[PDB]
Design a protein around this ligand. Structure first.
Ligand code: CL
Lengths: 259, 259
């Protein structure tokens, strides 16, 4: 399907590693869809070149440029920089439907069945489960929606200073409307929940389709022993999957640009 | 409405305080429904007498007795004692529909509109939000359902050793079926979330209808200064509401049995 895409975002090189692992994981699980990544000019040439290989489409978004539609909102609400960049996912009108996935997620299984879903479909956020988590969502690119989101960003901002507040505000019927727009939690499994509610993880986590690495320590912030194939220090399985992909697929890819 | 009830449970005197505050809070917000409390013989005469005043119905459940239907399951799965006692809420066939509320919840607003809901309606659990939280739920008393729950308890137990695992297992279509069976989070607002996702609380928590005091430190485990009208040590508003009711309504009630 050429009209549908997984879309991620990286604003820097550290999250490009995430993007690259995410993109690799989607190919690993044989997505039939396109892979698109939003990048900023802060993403270096080497990461960018690796992104051009992993992703079918690399889109540059520069909200620091006055030519950007979001730039005015950025001036007004500088804290929303990343949010505003992410919102450009709606500008990808070459696609009829996309699954947005943050660069700190990881695909463990084919999730092409998400394209059955409508905008706005997302998994509940743990913590405040009447908000959906904005790490993974099904949306329809539309200039109009983009404009409407930008407008909300400008007028109200984000109740949480991030994209999740803004998205929840805009798509506010999610909690109370249409159970199909609740993606199963396994499609955006918060890495925190994999110890916060451990009995639940043991009961339902073997079914995890997507892991969302939350907390301040991102996967790339870990040390990974390539001999023991495990990250160093508490349930590292997913970190280890991430690092296996990073070591197996991403690093050698990055390395070939040295020549 | 004489055929509908809020139903809580107390297995001991500490949770009877919770029950009493919960029952008082429901009257404070002018429920038109009956108030029922499941008690065990471990609840002392004084708490029991206070329960007889706050609640319209005080039901004694003694799963330690061989005459109890749950007793055999208790022998088999001793960890489920409290769960099995709670399951007797389904035995309350004098009511057509009930809202079960754990004794560690607190009503902040009339929630009689829960009786519009069907079994099984519950709020999402934070942590694993594709489970519902068993602190507050709308159910239909039925010997059959009780028997079926007991049977599941016996055969599979609880994936989390508590009632929530068992209830989620039995009512397992909740995550993926019927958005109306998702109670808004404000009807079972986890006290943890009131700091775990603080931006969300600031955005949506003023709407809280029910607070669910989770964590090991229950409201009665706090020290309350009756002069400053505040608990001692981090967002104590709800603790303070609980203690205000406890101080204002429950304690003087308890005291009158000294004579
Ligand atoms: Cl629905």
């Amino acid at each position: 399907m050429t009209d549908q895409a997984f879309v991620t975002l990286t604003t820097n090189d550290a999250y490009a590693k995430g993007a690259l692992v995410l993109g690799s994981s989607l190919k690993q699980h044989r997505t039939s869809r396109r892979l698109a990544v939003l990048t900023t000019p802060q993403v270096s040439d080497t990461m960018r070149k690796a992104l051009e290989i992993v992703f079918d489409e690399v889109i540059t978004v520069d909200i620091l440029d006055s030519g950007d539609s979001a730039h005015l909102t950025l001036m007004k609400r500088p804290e929303l920089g990343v949010t505003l960049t992410k919102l450009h996912c709606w500008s990808l009108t070459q696609y009829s439907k996309c699954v947005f996935m943050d660069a700190d997620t990881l695909v463990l299984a084919n999730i092409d069945d998400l394209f059955e879903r409508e905008e706005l479909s997302a998994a509940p956020d743990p913590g405040w489960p009447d908000c959906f988590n904005s790490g993974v969502f099904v949306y329809q690119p539309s200039v109009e929606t983009y404009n409407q989101l930008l407008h909300v960003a400008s007028e109200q901002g984000s109740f949480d200073g991030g994209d999740q507040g803004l998205l929840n505000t805009f798509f506010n019927s999610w909690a109370t409307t249409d159970i199909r727009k609740h993606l199963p939690f396994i499609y955006n499994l918060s890495s925190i929940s994999i110890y916060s509610y451990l009995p639940a993880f043991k009961a339902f986590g073997a079914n995890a389709k997507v892991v969302h690495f939350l907390g301040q320590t991102k996967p790339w912030n870990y040390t990974y022993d390539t001999k023991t194939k495990s990250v160093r220090s508490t349930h590292p399985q997913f970190l280890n999957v991430w690092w296996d992909i990073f070591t197996t697929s991403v690093v050698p890819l990055l390395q070939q640009f040295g020549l």
